[PDB]
Enzyme design. Structure first.
Site, PDB file in Angstrom:
ATOM      1  CB  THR A   1      30.362 -56.778  14.734  1.00 22.06           C
ATOM      2  OG1 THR A   1      30.985 -57.557  15.736  1.00 22.06           O
ATOM      3  CG2 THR A   1      29.808 -55.514  15.343  1.00 22.06           C
TER       4      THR A   1
ATOM      5  CG  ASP B   1      15.961 -70.616  -4.783  1.00 19.88           C
ATOM      6  OD1 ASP B   1      15.715 -69.764  -5.685  1.00 19.88           O
ATOM      7  OD2 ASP B   1      16.463 -70.368  -3.652  1.00 19.88           O
TER       8      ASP B   1
HETATM    9  C1  LIG Z   1      26.271 -51.173  11.293  1.00 24.72           C
HETATM   10  O1  LIG Z   1      24.871 -51.002  11.553  1.00 24.72           O
HETATM   11  C2  LIG Z   1      24.449 -50.656  12.819  1.00 24.72           C
HETATM   12  C3  LIG Z   1      25.445 -50.135  13.710  1.00 24.72           C
HETATM   13  C4  LIG Z   1      25.065 -49.820  15.032  1.00 24.72           C
HETATM   14  N1  LIG Z   1      26.049 -49.209  15.829  1.00 24.72           N
HETATM   15  C5  LIG Z   1      27.435 -49.433  15.861  1.00 24.72           C
HETATM   16  N2  LIG Z   1      28.096 -50.426  15.224  1.00 24.72           N
HETATM   17  C6  LIG Z   1      29.506 -50.553  15.413  1.00 24.72           C
HETATM   18  C7  LIG Z   1      30.203 -51.647  14.745  1.00 24.72           C
HETATM   19  C8  LIG Z   1      31.595 -51.816  14.899  1.00 24.72           C
HETATM   20  C9  LIG Z   1      32.358 -50.916  15.698  1.00 24.72           C
HETATM   21  C10 LIG Z   1      31.707 -49.843  16.360  1.00 24.72           C
HETATM   22  C11 LIG Z   1      30.279 -49.675  16.193  1.00 24.72           C
HETATM   23  N3  LIG Z   1      29.545 -48.623  16.828  1.00 24.72           N
HETATM   24  C12 LIG Z   1      29.923 -47.630  17.627  1.00 24.72           C
HETATM   25  N4  LIG Z   1      28.832 -46.876  17.979  1.00 24.72           N
HETATM   26  N5  LIG Z   1      27.732 -47.394  17.390  1.00 24.72           N
HETATM   27  C13 LIG Z   1      28.128 -48.488  16.662  1.00 24.72           C
HETATM   28  C14 LIG Z   1      23.737 -49.910  15.485  1.00 24.72           C
HETATM   29  C15 LIG Z   1      22.786 -50.440  14.563  1.00 24.72           C
HETATM   30  O2  LIG Z   1      21.489 -50.562  15.040  1.00 24.72           O
HETATM   31  C16 LIG Z   1      21.188 -50.184  16.385  1.00 24.72           C
HETATM   32  C17 LIG Z   1      23.137 -50.797  13.239  1.00 24.72           C
HETATM   33 CA   LIG Z   2      30.036 -57.873  17.395  1.00 23.76          CA
HETATM   34 CA   LIG Z   3      14.400 -68.581  -7.108  1.00 22.90          CA
HETATM   35 ZN   LIG Z   4      34.111 -59.775  17.960  1.00 27.35          ZN
END
Ligand SMILES: COc1cc(Nc2nc3ccccc3n3cnnc23)cc(OC)c1
Ligand SMILES: [Ca+2]
Ligand SMILES: [Ca+2]
Ligand SMILES: [Zn+2]
Ligand SMILES: *[C@@H]1O[C@H](CO)[C@@H](O[C@@H]2O[C@H](CO)[C@@H](O[C@@H]3O[C@H](CO[C@H]4O[C@H](CO)[C@@H](O)[C@H](O[C@H]5O[C@H](CO)[C@@H](O)[C@H](O)[C@@H]5O[C@H]5O[C@H](CO)[C@@H](O)[C@H](O)[C@@H]5O)[C@@H]4O)[C@@H](O)[C@H](O[C@H]4O[C@H](CO)[C@@H](O)[C@H](O)[C@@H]4O[C@H]4O[C@H](CO)[C@@H](O)[C@H](O)[C@@H]4O)[C@@H]3O)[C@H](O)[C@H]2NC(C)=O)[C@H](O)[C@H]1NC(C)=O
Ligand code: NA
Ligand code: NA
Length: 809
Positions: free
Chosen positions: A159, A687
């Site tokens: 995630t 690389d």
């Molecule tokens: C980490 O980086 C990003 C996070 C989100 N959002 C979220 N990530 C979660 C991950 C785990 C648990 C709850 C989470 N959550 C709850 N409410 N929003 C979020 C969106 C991103 O780009 C649109 C980039």
């Molecule tokens: Ca996920």
């Molecule tokens: Ca390199």
């Molecule tokens: Zn999961």
């Protein structure tokens, strides 16, 4: 410390964040235990639920209610999302015919169409078809907007690495979120899903979309939601923000759903329990679209419906245990599950040795369900090595499996039975890991299917949708122009930095003292002019079909023409940077004749001082050599001598020559047969610091013993043909088709457990694992391909990002 005795009155879901010890009223305050004392009362109302009913229509406003059905609610911006349907005779958005959105239809005061990112955790690509009967709102977005049949996540398919890739356009090795769990040895600090370290800004690199927007004067919603805020309240909050005055109103918003991931872990990707989560997500989409329609924004907003990764069947019985392989299992730390990462338990333990751990983990059990790698040896398409948070030892786990350190890690008393039926994290080419992309709105195309693409590309497009200049990232800007009605990004090709030399015959045979020999003294006015024309490039249009690659860094190199192939020969690296040749469907394979087995011939166009020598290979007991243009595919016995030029030779470990010889002798002809001719560009890659980028000369760690001949870390090939395979590769009028690989140049075949068998049983399987995009090879070589085609440049950019995956339907 938080002074929680401030108040959220008139601040509910405020956009600016307040610094401690002042109490917060924003959508993340719960996650930091910092909300003001009255945040639930004022900001999280639930009274009377989320839908208007007939008897609430025209009600006297009651400020306690979760949402409103009073006459004033539209001007307040806080009606229940079904208000106009229940009370004003309107239709739900999903029941309206779909009609093309040719231009944004936005209220006055809107400077740009807002963007809403609707993120769904664990939403496997096949749910779009398999669940379509229970997801009418999502199906309308999909069928009416622009959709891909699937979108490829980054590795690992977890995630946080994927959501943060979505937001930055960066590979995890570059943005720093390389797993859901991490140790950083410089900080001496650990990142986990649960807890507080993850909020520290030092973990999070690159520049995410909300920061890019804010720096450039485009206001952003706060993207993240504490888990206990119900989805209905997240939607209402977005709709309320969309009713703010012009100067206060964000232009970009994010909704996040923890489903279907949450249920998918418990029930497996297709458990019968999964239908309800899919129905609920669809209902939330319907709430949002109904709400947009009430605000007259449903033909103004661009909506992206996007997932982070899929979900596979995984149960705790399918777990491999390191305790069955390693003697010293208590001297290691393992990050476990659908990938493994191993490091020493103690930095004070000088008996720890990565070599012996790798060997103890290599092909030990007949059906072993993971494969160990030093991280620099992982497939280059994973881009998973250049970060101190990625442990040197990596386990790639087969789909449907886990790895763990010891059995006790997997169970708990009294019964020891486990719970879960789904998981994700595997190789991002695995079909069950693929996820979804739909774009709907004025800026996206109408009823358009686009080919699968990688989630690293989306940041650029989101910037395009908002009129932002993207921060430097790993997308290829313009490669997704075909998703868009307008706001396309029209890149120009990079300028060539180094111009080639075109050497003629400049050296006599006796000036060379390379220690090579060849039985080639076989001694015609007709045919002599013919061979001279070949050397000046008379067949070059046959073998260089898309122009010569451009060299995008400063170097000295020569173009060398031959009957059967053309090359760009580096005087610095003593070998070609690229070798280009076309093999038609009708081409025949021949043998290397007996008298030519060990033949290597000086190239009279290239000085002895800029040539390899045979003595170095004789003296290097570990290293042999191969050829870039394969002698097996020579057009005639006379042209075959060109293939043994010292300028076509490259260093190869004997183990690697097994792989390379089979590719050249068997597989090239096979592809020409199947594809109606192929054009092949092959070459070395260096690389040594595993950063995904071309090494300079002073980064080379290994040479052929005694010499200045650098040893490649990898060999690539780019194999191009006509997408319409009724046309031969060399007379193609339309779009192209490509597949490529970056093969690791290893002194053993320990990666292929069946390597003692005939190459027909393991070599192609190896090459598939090391499939690559042309863009990957570009980064690794500083070359720019497909410079002269009849195709539009954005179409070429899409072609350069294509990955041939070798996954079934
Ligand atoms: C980490 O980086 C990003 C996070 C989100 N959002 C979220 N990530 C979660 C991950 C785990 C648990 C709850 C989470 N959550 C709850 N409410 N929003 C979020 C969106 C991103 O780009 C649109 C980039
Ligand atoms: Ca996920
Ligand atoms: Ca390199
Ligand atoms: Zn999961
Ligand atoms: C995918 O896209 C990305 C983004 O375009 C590409 O990454 C870029 O690659 C460049 C080359 O590797 C790199 O440029 C370097 O920048 C250095 C300054 O870096 C800081 O500032 C930037 C700009 O804001 C910032 O983004 C950086 O962020 C990194 O580091 C922070 C903190 O550690 C992390 O939070 C963040 O996640 C990110 O980490 C990633 O990158 C770093 C490298 O920067 C890695 O070490 C990590 O593992 C991780 O992957 C920084 O805060 C600058 O110092 C460099 O210049 C040196 O090298 C040049 C060579 O030209 C030399 O001339 C200079 O003198 C200098 O050398 C000196 O230092 C050497 C090393 O210590 C030393 O040996 C010498 O003797 C000298 O003293 C360099 O220009 C750029 O930073 C990144 N950007 C990002 C965001 O990652 C990536 O290549 C793409 N991938 C592919 C495959 O195409
Ligand atoms: Na040798
Ligand atoms: Na082997």
């Amino acid at each position: 410390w938080t002074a929680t005795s401030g108040s959220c009155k008139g601040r509910c879901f405020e956009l600016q964040e307040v610094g401690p010890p002042d109490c917060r009223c924003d959508n993340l305050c719960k996650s930091y235990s910092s909300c003001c004392h009255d945040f639930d009362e004022l900001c999280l109302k639930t009274a009377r639920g989320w839908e208007c009913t007939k008897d609430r229509c025209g009600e006297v406003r009651n400020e306690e209610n979760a949402c409103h059905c009073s006459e004033d609610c539209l001007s307040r911006g806080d009606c229940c999302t079904n208000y106009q349907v229940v009370c004003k005779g309107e239709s739900h958005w999903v029941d309206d015919d779909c009609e093309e959105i040719k231009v944004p239809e936005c209220p006055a005061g809107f400077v740009r169409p807002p963007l809403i990112i609707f993120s769904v955790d664990g939403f496997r690509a096949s749910y779009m078809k398999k669940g379509s009967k229970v997801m009418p709102n999502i199906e309308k977005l999909r069928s009416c907007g622009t959709h891909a049949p699937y979108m490829r996540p980054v590795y690992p398919t977890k995630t946080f690495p994927n959501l943060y890739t979505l937001a930055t356009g960066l590979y995890p090795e570059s943005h720093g979120i390389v797993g859901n769990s991490m140790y950083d040895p410089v900080f001496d600090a650990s990142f986990h899903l649960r807890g507080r370290e993850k909020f520290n800004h030092r973990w999070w690199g690159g520049q995410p979309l909300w920061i890019t927007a804010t720096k450039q004067g485009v206001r952003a919603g706060t993207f993240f939601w504490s888990v206990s805020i119900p989805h209905e309240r997240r939607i209402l909050t977005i709709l309320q923000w969309l009713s703010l005055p012009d100067n206060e109103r964000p232009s970009v918003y994010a909704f996040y759903s923890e489903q279907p991931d949450f249920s998918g872990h418990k029930y497996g990707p297709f458990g019968p329990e999964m239908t309800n989560p899919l129905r609920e997500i669809d209902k939330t989409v319907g709430q949002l679209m109904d709400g947009l329609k009430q605000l007259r924004l449903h033909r103004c907003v661009n909506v992206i419906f996007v997932g982070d990764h899929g979900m596979e069947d995984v149960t705790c019985d399918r777990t491999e245990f390191l305790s069955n392989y390693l003697t010293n299992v208590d001297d290691i730390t393992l990050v476990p599950g659908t990938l493994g990462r191993i490091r020493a338990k103690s930095i004070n333990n000088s008996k720890y040795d990565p070599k012996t751990i790798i060997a103890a983990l290599t092909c030990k059990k007949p059906d072993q369900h993971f494969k160990p790698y030093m991280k620099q040896h992982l497939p280059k398409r994973l881009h998973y090595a250049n970060n101190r948070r990625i442990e040197d030892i990596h386990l790639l786990v087969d789909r449907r499996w886990h790895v763990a350190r010891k059995p006790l890690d997997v169970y708990k008393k009294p019964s020891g039975k486990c719970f879960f039926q789904g998981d994700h994290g595997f190789d991002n080419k695995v079909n069950s890991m693929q996820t979804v992309f739909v774009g709907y709105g004025p800026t996206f195309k109408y009823r358009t299917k686009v080919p699968p693409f990688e989630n690293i590309e989306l940041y650029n497009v989101m910037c395009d949708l908002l009129g932002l200049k993207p921060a430097p990232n790993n997308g290829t800007h313009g490669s997704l122009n075909h998703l868009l009605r307008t706001n396309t990004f029209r890149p120009t090709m990079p300028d060539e930095v180094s111009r080639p030399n075109y050497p003629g015959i400049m050296y006599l045979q006796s000036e060379f003292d390379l220690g090579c020999t060849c039985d080639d003294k076989v001694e015609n006015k007709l045919e002599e002019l013919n061979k001279r024309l070949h050397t000046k490039g008379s067949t070059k249009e046959r073998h260089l079909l898309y122009g010569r690659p451009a060299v995008l860094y400063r170097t000295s190199y020569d173009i060398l023409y031959h009957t059967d192939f053309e090359s760009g020969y580096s005087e610095i690296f003593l070998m070609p940077l690229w070798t280009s040749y076309t093999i038609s469907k009708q081409a025949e394979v021949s043998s290397i004749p007996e008298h030519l087995t060990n033949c290597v011939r000086p190239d009279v166009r290239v000085s002895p001082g800029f040539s390899q020598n045979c003595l170095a290979y004789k003296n290097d007991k570990q290293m042999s050599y191969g050829f870039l243009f394969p002698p097996y595919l020579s057009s005639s016995p006379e042209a075959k001598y060109d293939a043994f030029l010292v300028t076509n030779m490259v260093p190869m470990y004997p183990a690697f020559k097994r792989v390379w010889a089979y590719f050249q002798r068997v597989l090239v002809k096979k592809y020409a047969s199947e594809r109606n001719g192929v054009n092949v560009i092959s070459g070395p890659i260096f690389d040594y610091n595993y950063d995904g980028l071309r090494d300079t000369e002073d980064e080379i760690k290994q040479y052929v013993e005694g010499s200045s001949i650098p040893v490649p870390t990898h060999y690539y090939s780019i194999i191009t043909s006509c997408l319409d395979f009724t046309q031969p590769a060399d007379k193609c009028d339309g779009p192209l088709s490509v597949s490529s690989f970056i093969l690791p140049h290893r002194p053993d075949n320990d990666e292929s457990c069946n390597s003692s068998e005939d190459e027909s049983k393991w070599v192609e399987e190896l090459m598939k694992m090391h499939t690559a995009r042309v863009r990957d090879i570009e980064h690794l070589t500083g070359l720019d391909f497909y410079r002269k085609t009849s195709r539009s440049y954005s179409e070429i950019l899409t072609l350069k990002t294509y990955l041939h995956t070798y996954e079934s339907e």
